[PDB]
Amino acid sequence: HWGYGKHNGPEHWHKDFPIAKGERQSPVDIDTHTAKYDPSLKPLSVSYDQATSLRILNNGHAFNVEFDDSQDKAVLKGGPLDGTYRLIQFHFHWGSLDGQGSEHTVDKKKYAAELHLVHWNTKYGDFGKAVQQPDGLAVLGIFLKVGSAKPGLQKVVDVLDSIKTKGKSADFTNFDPRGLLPESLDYWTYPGSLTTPPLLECVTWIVLKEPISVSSEQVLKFRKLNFNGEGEPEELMVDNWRPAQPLKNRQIKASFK
Numbered sequence: 001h002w003g004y005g006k007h008n009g010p011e012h013w014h015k016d017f018p019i020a021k022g023e024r025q026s027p028v029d030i031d032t033h034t035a036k037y038d039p040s041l042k043p044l045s046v047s048y049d050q051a052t053s054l055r056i057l058n059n060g061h062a063f064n065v066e067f068d069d070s071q072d073k074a075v076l077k078g079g080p081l082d083g084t085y086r087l088i089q090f091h092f093h094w095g096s097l098d099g100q101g102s103e104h105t106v107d108k109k110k111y112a113a114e115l116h117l118v119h120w121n122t123k124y125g126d127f128g129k130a131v132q133q134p135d136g137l138a139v140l141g142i143f144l145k146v147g148s149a150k151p152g153l154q155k156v157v158d159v160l161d162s163i164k165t166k167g168k169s170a171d172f173t174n175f176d177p178r179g180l181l182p183e184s185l186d187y188w189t190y191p192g193s194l195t196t197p198p199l200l201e202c203v204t205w206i207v208l209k210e211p212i213s214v215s216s217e218q219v220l221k222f223r224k225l226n227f228n229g230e231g232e233p234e235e236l237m238v239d240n241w242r243p244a245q246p247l248k249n250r251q252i253k254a255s256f257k
């Protein structure tokens with residue numbers, strides 16, 4: 001199957017998922033000088049106070065912290081969005097070195113990692129139906145740079161040993177995702193896609209301008225995870241990021257002047 005290796009990595013995905021060469025693929029490079037401020041963009045509304053996390057799972061490509069999305073608990077609205085989007089899970093993409101790891105880039109700059117808070121449009125009823133729609137998902141992207149530790153990330157770092165290999169999961173209740181947000185909600189937004197197969201073109205991307213800082217020790221722990229399952233040759237889970245894709249006929253809008 002697909003992955004991030006030399007023989008099954010991003011350059012190969014188009015053979016099983018032709019949409020990989022589509023008109024609105026993600027990630028993209030955000031050219032800060034070309035992005036245009038859009039004064040009509042409403043401020044983002046991130047309501048995570050009633051968030052209910054459930055479990056953390058190593059799925060062989062990244063680890064996902066899953067939330068109960070059977071009710072309007074944790075929701076994203078406003079900004080470029082029409083309607084209410086419910087948080088279903090968050091995950092990260094990271095590198096084998098601090099100089100790479102993010103999927104979106106800013107003026108070609110690569111960050112050490114990137115957090116994706118995934119939300120689906122409640123007008124579509126469930127996640128599976130939402131990914132089949134052009135405005136089905138809203139993903140909040142947050143860059144991570146290596147520096148000071150992020151306290152709100154430590155509980156995730158400490159449970160990683162329990163989900164080292166593909167297919168392993170662990171209880172992960174009472175985790176507050178608000179601890180992963182930067183101070184400012186200034187953002188860039190554009191229409192795009194899932195960045196892993198099936199690469200569906202169903203995402204309104206909202207990428208925050210302000211990165212969060214995490215420590216070298218925190219990201220080092222991410223790099224101890226495994227892509228393989230237990231009892232299989234160890235392949236470290238590093239560089240699970242897709243590189244920037246052609247912008248094509250799209251404009252990236254900024255919420256700030």
Ligand SMILES: O=C(O)/C=C/c1ccc(O)c(O)c1
Pocket residue numbers: 116118139194195196197198
């Ligand atoms: O196939 C699915 O069921 C979900 C895929 C998925 C979900 C969230 C992402 O950011 C992404 O790249 C892919």
Ligand SMILES: [Zn+2]
Pocket residue numbers: 091092093116195
């Ligand atoms: Zn992602």
